[PDB]
Amino acid sequence: DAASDLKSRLDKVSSFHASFTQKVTDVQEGQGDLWVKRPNLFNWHMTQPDESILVSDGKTLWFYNPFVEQATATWLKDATGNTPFMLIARNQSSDWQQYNIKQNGDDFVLTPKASNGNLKQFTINVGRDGTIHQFSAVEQDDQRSSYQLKSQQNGAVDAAKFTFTPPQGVTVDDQRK
Numbered sequence: 001d002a003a004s005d006l007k008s009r010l011d012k013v014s015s016f017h018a019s020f021t022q023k024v025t026d027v028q029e030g031q032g033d034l035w036v037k038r039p040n041l042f043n044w045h046m047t048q049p050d051e052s053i054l055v056s057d058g059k060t061l062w063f064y065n066p067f068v069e070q071a072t073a074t075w076l077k078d079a080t081g082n083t084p085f086m087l088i089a090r091n092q093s094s095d096w097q098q099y100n101i102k103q104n105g106d107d108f109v110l111t112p113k114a115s116n117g118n119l120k121q122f123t124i125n126v127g128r129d130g131t132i133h134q135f136s137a138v139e140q141d142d143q144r145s146s147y148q149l150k151s152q153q154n155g156a157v158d159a160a161k162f163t164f165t166p167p168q169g170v171t172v173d174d175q176r177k
């Protein structure tokens with residue numbers, strides 16, 4: 001069905017680096033960069049609305065906001081598809097099943113089946129070759145964001161991209177029970 005088709009497309013390329021022009025509104029332009037190593041490794045970096053870094057080492061998900069010298073460590077398994085990049089990063093059947101999906105070729109539009117969700121809408125254009133051309137989302141607070149592919153390079157990614165280490169003066173809040 002649409003959910004399985006979408007997941008297959010997002011699993012087509014085992015390892016890749018995709019760069020995106022980012023647009024956010026509460027139009028603020030930024031940059032979004034995603035590094036992936038299926039199925040559980042990823043690194044996401046964006047500049048809007050605030051510079052944020054998300055790194056999964058396979059079991060721990062690190063959330064870092066550089067301009068605040070703070071980072072939070074959580075269990076990757078406890079993460080949710082609360083943002084468009086997290087949905088793509090996780091690419092979990094359990095996530096897609098929670099949305100009413102509508103597909104037409106490479107285009108997908110998703111809306112949550114139930115309330116109590118930070119995401120009111122998510123859209124994505126991804127071909128069967130695994131190239132993510134664009135994606136967007138509308139969050140509960142009416143915040144909207146869109147991403148347009150600048151370039152996607154398929155291939156092995158350095159392991160260091162999937163490990164986290166703040167510079168200095170950074171406080172780590174460990175939420176892994």
Ligand SMILES: [Mg+2]
Nearest residue numbers: 017018019033
């Ligand atoms: Mg890059």
Ligand SMILES: [Mg+2]
Nearest residue numbers: 132133134149
């Ligand atoms: Mg394109």
Ligand SMILES: [Zn+2]
Nearest residue numbers: 017018019153
């Ligand atoms: Zn690159």
Ligand SMILES: [Zn+2]
Nearest residue numbers: 045046051066
């Ligand atoms: Zn940065």
Ligand SMILES: [Zn+2]
Nearest residue numbers: 126127131133
């Ligand atoms: Zn394409």
